[PDB]
């Protein structure tokens, strides 16, 4: 005994199990012989609305995603396991999120689409700040004063304890208004972003960093060749 029990709540959704993994494994093989070309995207992170926009703008070329090991097994980790000649080459190359994008369009269309495409996203940890953001020397605002304070409503006091106890900033509450004793420079251009800094920026909604998905490897269903490109 003495083992702590797992916390459980009666949610409305249940687990999927290995059934979904097996279904994806079968679907990868069933779609490999259909589309003319197959690609793997090194999309570290994509917002669900962004992914849906890409899919609808690219629905003609169906996108497949899943666990890295499952997709590599479906594609084959070696020649003896490849579903098609040279297919296993892209499986080894991929290291991050799979992003297995099947497409009927040639290399030129894919590379042009992935070069023209670009979207904004929050700056993640280990990156450098794309802008400078200093909080005022008084009441804080939802956007931190990057926009005119006449329209930037003050931050809701209910979130003050989180800032006080987690972000370490000298936040204090005065008559229900969050205030700081100095203009704390949370981040500056060229400064490496910490996890706390990234969370602070996300809270303020400063999505100044740009993001664009990149393709790692290419495969042809009729030429039996694989190519890799660094184009983002």
């Amino acid at each position: 005994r003495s083992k702590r029990s797992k916390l459980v709540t009666l949610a409305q959704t249940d687990k999927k199990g290995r059934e979904n993994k097996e279904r994806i494994f079968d679907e990868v093989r069933e779609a490999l012989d259909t589309y003319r070309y197959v690609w793997v995207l090194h999309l570290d992170d994509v917002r669900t609305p962004v992914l849906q926009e890409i899919r609808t703008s690219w629905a003609g070329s169906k996108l497949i995603m899943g666990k890295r090991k499952v997709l590599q097994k479906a594609l084959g980790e070696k020649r003896e396991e490849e579903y098609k000649e040279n297919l296993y080459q892209l499986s080894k190359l991929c290291s991050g999120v799979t992003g297995l994008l099947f497409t009927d369009e040639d290399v030129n269309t894919v590379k042009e689409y992935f070069k023209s495409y670009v979207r904004s996203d929050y700056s993640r940890p280990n990156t450098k700040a794309p802008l400078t953001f200093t909080i005022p020397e008084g009441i804080v605002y939802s956007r931190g004063g990057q926009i005119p304070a006449e329209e930037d409503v003050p931050m809701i006091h209910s979130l003050e304890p989180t800032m006080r106890n987690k972000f370490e900033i000298p936040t204090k509450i005065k008559a229900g208004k969050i205030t700081i004793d100095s203009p704390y420079l949370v981040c500056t251009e060229g400064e490496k972003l910490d996890v706390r800094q990234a969370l602070i920026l996300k809270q303020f909604g400063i999505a100044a960093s740009e993001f664009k998905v990149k393709v790692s490897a290419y495969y042809d269903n009729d030429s039996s060749t694989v190519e890799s490109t660094n184009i983002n």
Binding site: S2, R164, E168, P170, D181, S182
Partner: protein, 190 residues
Amino acid sequence: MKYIQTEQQIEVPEGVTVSIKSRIVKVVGPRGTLTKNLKHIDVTFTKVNNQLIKVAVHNGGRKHVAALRTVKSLVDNMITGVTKGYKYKMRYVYAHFPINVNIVEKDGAKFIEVRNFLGDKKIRNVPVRDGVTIEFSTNVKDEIVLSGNSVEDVSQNAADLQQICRVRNKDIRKFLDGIYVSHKGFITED
């Protein structure tokens, strides 16, 4: 189920060195030295390469094995404190009565004073444990920075400071006056 042998590995950087014998433990480093007694824990130490220290328990049950992990945790905490150190940002707040904090050396012993809490005329003092240093934080109002090497001593001093000034027979939801630990960190900025 009466494990034949269980052990944990302690990693020590080149910046610190330790010598191990009977459970009196010696630790040395740039910030000074620390000592601890574990003769009541009944565990065995073993060095392999002068940078990894093995702690193993033979024929020990789960209750006994639980001390094996805590010994390694304490050793790691001592090593970190000797190398980096621990700095605690202690903050006190008030609404009407300005809380007065002073440092005195009555009878040689160092003490931390608390006065004017909710208008109380009683004088409160807390002895400063060995290795703990006190200095007022800069550019921060009503902040006291406790610093020291030993984690246990500094943590106990901070707990005593924040717990002796209890709000007594008053509305806790309303009377926010008091002293609380605001942040825990290391002396070295890294």
